[PDB]
Each structure stands twice: as C-alpha cells, then as structure tokens.
Amino acid sequence: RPFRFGVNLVPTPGVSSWRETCRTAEQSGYDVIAVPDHLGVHSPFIAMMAAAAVTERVQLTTFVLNSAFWNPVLLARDLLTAHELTGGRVEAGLGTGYVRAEFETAGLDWGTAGTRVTRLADTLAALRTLAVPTPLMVGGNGDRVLGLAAEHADTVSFSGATLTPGTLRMITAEAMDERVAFFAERAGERDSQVERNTLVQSVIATDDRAATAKAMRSRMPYLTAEQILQLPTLLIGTPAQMAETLLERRERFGFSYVCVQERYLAAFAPVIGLLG
Ligand SMILES: C[C@H](OP(=O)(O)OC[C@@H](O)[C@@H](O)[C@@H](O)Cn1c2nc(=O)[nH]c(=O)c-2cc2ccc(O)cc21)C(=O)N[C@@H](CCC(=O)N[C@@H](CCC(=O)O)C(=O)O)C(=O)O
Questions:
Q1: Which residues form the Luciferase-like domain (predicted)?
Q2: Ligand 1 pocket check: which of 41, 98, 152 to mutate, most ligand atoms within 8 Å of Cβ?
C-alpha cells in the first residue's frame, strides 16, 4: 500500500500554538494529524475541528480514544458530525485505555483487563451497527484487541511497546513479526483490506547508526545493539537510510501508515521528501 505519514500532535491547555503547529505539520508534507485522548490534554474532536479550520489536505485522526471515556451512541453522533462538518476528513482510532489514574479522576470503573477490552468490543460493534462514515482504526497488541481490529477496523495500529497497566518496554522486530502474523491470521480473507500503522517513537539523525545503537543499549539494556537497529519504534541514520529502512519495514511488516511523535516532526520531514 502507498505510504501515508502522520504526526502525533498534543493540543495542550494553556499553549496558544495549536493552529501554527497544525499548519507546520501540513506544510512539512504530513498526510495525517493525529491527536491523543487523555485528561489534561485538549478534547480530541474539538481540537481536530480547530485543526481542520487551518488545514486543507491532511486527514485528522484520534490516536487513539480511550473507550472508557465514550458512550458508543454519543460517539457515533460525534463521528457523523465530524465527518459531515469537515467534508470527510476525520478518522477514528480507538483503544481500551490504560492510565488507571485517569479512570479514577473521571469516576470510571477501572475494572479488569477483560472488562476494558470488552468495552472496546462493545463500542466497535455499536459503531459498525450505526454505520458511522469515519474510517475506524484499532490500536494495541493484546490478542483480543488485535482480534477486534481484524474483525472491525479499516486500519490496525501495532503498538511497539508494552507496559504494566496500573513501565514502558520496546518490543523486538521478532515479537512484532509474531503480532503482525497473529493479526493476519485473525483477519483471514479481510487481511488485504486493512491498512497497517505503527508509531515510531524516536527519529534519530546520525552519521553513525552503529555507534548510536550501541549507546542506546543504556536506555534499553534488555536488547542488543543489533536488535535496537531493527526495532520498529526507532528510526536511526541519515534520511536516505531511514527511507530505506521504511521501505524494508513495509515489506517485512506491511507498515505503510507511519506516524511519528511531535518532537520529531522536523526530523522526519526529510524522509517524507525522499519517499515522495
Ligand atoms: C496495556 C497494553 O495492552 P495493549 O493491548 O497493547 O493496549 C491496550 C491499550 O493500551 C490500547 O488499546 C490503547 O488504548 C492505547 N493507546 C492510547 N490509549 C489512551 O488511553 N490514550 C491515548 O492517547 C492512546 C494512544 C495510543 C496510540 C497508539 C497505540 O497503539 C495505542 C494507544 C500492554 O502493554 N499489554 C501487555 C500486557 C499488559 C499486562 O496486563 N501486563 C501485566 C504484567 C504484570 C502482571 O502480571 O500483573 C499487568 O500489569 O497486569 C501485552 O500485551 O504484553
């Protein structure tokens, strides 16, 4: 599938640069602006509308909603509105949620891993029954979550890290091979209709990839330097090397929808220039 590039921007209360940041993303060649769903961050659909008002080309996506924060019928109303009032520019990524303190602050039941995944399942089923027009993305690497992506999603987002719900660890390329294969087996005949996304956490410009990876073992001691050089959540080297890496990873994993974090917006833009 043709590449599409996203930048995960954090609309921040008290910071007056939202419109300028969204314009920079579009001017830098990104195809998607992605926004998160967290307490203490601006409300995602309202921020996406504010982005739509100052951009013309980019798609706007939630990346990803905390399913515990949304009533499915009311979310369906939001999605239809966002779709119609932007001219079809909105996509909705969904997840189970994972920050327990935020559930507690909002007065919501943390429950169990099972109830949190079931809430995502129930929401996805409802959104499809209500025939929402926004493309749907599902994010997360748990078995049940990838099964839901395979059943319901237009895009599956493969995480690239794990944590203990209630600390972050990057997964290896080999673990990622297995998660993509699991998804594909669950998707069956629908595999070819689901776009594959991943989020790159760090985009590290360097003229010495090997020395950089060796140094980075300090922050990820559970990995070798060779594993660090193959980690799907990291891009290391020159822009030409990073472009070649993304071509190789599209072949290996099927990743054609690549997002980066806001801090690396400018660092990654040269790669967009080379892949287009
Ligand atoms: C928690 C995570 O599961 P997951 O299925 O990968 O992801 C579930 C949710 O986090 C996920 O669906 C989404 O909500 C997360 N999500 C966001 N969630 C949000 O709430 N807000 C966001 O802005 C957000 C952004 C986002 C972007 C990309 C992406 O891929 C996911 C994103 C995980 O790391 N799972 C581990 C295991 C987790 C676990 O339970 N560990 C044990 C270990 C220790 C023990 O034994 O007790 C535990 O702590 O209980 C695994 O599958 O190996």
A1: 2-248
A2: 98
